[PDB]
């Protein structure tokens, strides 16, 4: 019953890629300290390859939250812990707005 | 060093959200028996910031990629897929250590 949110990363401008990659480690290790965040995870784009393809613009890296429960992200949302990584994630990596994800059982 | 691929899926014009849900978990339920694919996931998207749902493939190394490659079995679950997904924006991942 895990809640999911997926976020799709763009490099800011005026960083280089090695930058972006060393930001993007940096926001993983400060993720273990937030509170009612369960699990952080951000990984690269590596590459952007017989289904109609998709048109939507270029992205650099991913980022996924996992949250126990309600709970759990309320005491995320109050943290100044939190905040203070949302700050990082906005100005360094890219971070915006996420897609919220539900399992497709029951 | 497990390879990860990430795709966008947008549900094929006219299919109901109900018929997108259920061809989603088939399609889960026969990624289990795809040979050199590890682990699947799909998830639908709840809300957005139009992607219908998040599929995601994990291989153990290029060998079992090579594998899932070569199945026609694989090939059948993509013909499957075919079904549900109008279209579909594929991503290779990597870690960033
Ligand atoms: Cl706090």
Same mark, same amino acid.
């Given at each position: ?44 784009? !590596? ?6 393809? &998709?048109?939507? *613009? ?8 996992? =949250? ?9 949302? !109050? ?6 990584? &949302?700050?990082? *994630? ?8 996420? =897609? ?7």
């Amino acid at each position: 019953g895990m809640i999911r949110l997926l976020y799709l990363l763009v490099k800011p401008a005026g960083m280089s890629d090695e930058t972006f990659r060393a930001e993007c480690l940096r926001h993983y290790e400060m993720s273990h300290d937030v509170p009612g965040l369960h699990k952080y995870e951000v990984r690269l784009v !590596a590459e952007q390859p017989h289904v109609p393809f &998709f048109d939507i *613009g270029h992205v650099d890296a991913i980022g996924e939250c996992w =949250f126990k429960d309600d709970a759990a992200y309320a005491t995320y949302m !109050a943290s100044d812990i939190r905040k203070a990584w &949302f700050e990082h *994630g906005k100005t360094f990596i890219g971070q915006l707005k996420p =897609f919220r994800t539900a399992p497709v059982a029951g």
